[PDB]
From a paper:
The filamentous soft-rot fungus Hypocrea jecorina (previously Trichoderma reesei) secretes large quantities of carbohydrate degrading enzymes that act synergistically to degrade cellulose and related plant biomass components. One of these newly identified proteins that were found to be co-regulated with the major H. jecorina cellulases was a protein that was denoted Cellulose induced protein 1 (Cip1). The Cip1 core domain structure is best classified as having a β-sandwich jelly-roll fold.
The two β-sheets consist of a total of 15 β-strands, eight in β-sheet A and seven in β-sheet B. One of these β-sheets (B) forms the floor of a large cleft and in the lower part of the molecule there is a “grip”-like motif where part of the other β-sheet (A) forms the “palm” and a protruding loop forms the “bent fingers”. A calcium atom was found to provide the best fit with regards to both B factor and metal coordination geometry. The side chains of Glu7, Ser37 and Asp206 provide four of these, the latter bindjng in a bidentate mode with both oxygen atoms. This can be seen in the structure, where Asn156 binds a NAG on the surface of Cip1 just outside the “grip” region. To summarise, Cip1 has two major regions with structural similarity to lyases; the potential active site cleft, which resembles that of an alginate lyase from the Chlorella virus, and the “grip” motif, which binds calcium and resembles that of a glucuronan lyase from H. jecorina.
Numbering used by the authors: 1 to 218
Write the structure that this text describes.
Amino acid sequence: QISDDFESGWDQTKWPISAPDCNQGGTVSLDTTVAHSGSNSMKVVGGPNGYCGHIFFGTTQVPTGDVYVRAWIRLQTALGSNHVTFIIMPDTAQGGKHLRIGGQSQVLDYNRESDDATLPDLSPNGIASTVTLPTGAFQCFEYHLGTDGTIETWLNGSLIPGMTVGPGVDNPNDAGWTRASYIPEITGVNFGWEAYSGDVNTVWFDDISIASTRVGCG
Ligand SMILES: [Ca+2]
């Protein structure tokens, strides 16, 4: 459980840098000119050096059991076709490999590092069932990881059907995700930018809350 409006700045021990394996060219900084709440947010700029250009800040202060994450997110450039990532969660259910939230085929999705599965399937109907991340303004992004396989995702309070799965929940485009039984067991949440293609973008994060209960959009 952890929250931050960044109005007291960037506490670097609360929100350390993460750049697994390699670190070349990405930046994390407090921005005092772009924000959702108040004056400040966290600005992440991916470096132009493929995967190694990645960078994140994050925390291991995550509850066990149900987890709700909420962040206000501003994206500079529209999501393209390439596979990109802006949230990584080390996952015990994948032996430490990452549950990722990002973009592919111009829309938001989940991705498992272990087997490269996506939620939704990136079929035409799957793509239609998820959404783009609008640019140039802070968006309220929230998700819930349950204990029974449930995953729920909201943008500006509206459920994203393609990015929602779980016991008895009818998602017609969840085949890749549910091939094997998968229940997340995350140990951290990291916010930033990563792209194997070397796609560069700038993403700002403000008003982060991680909790055992639904946060909402204020
Ligand atoms: Ca703020």
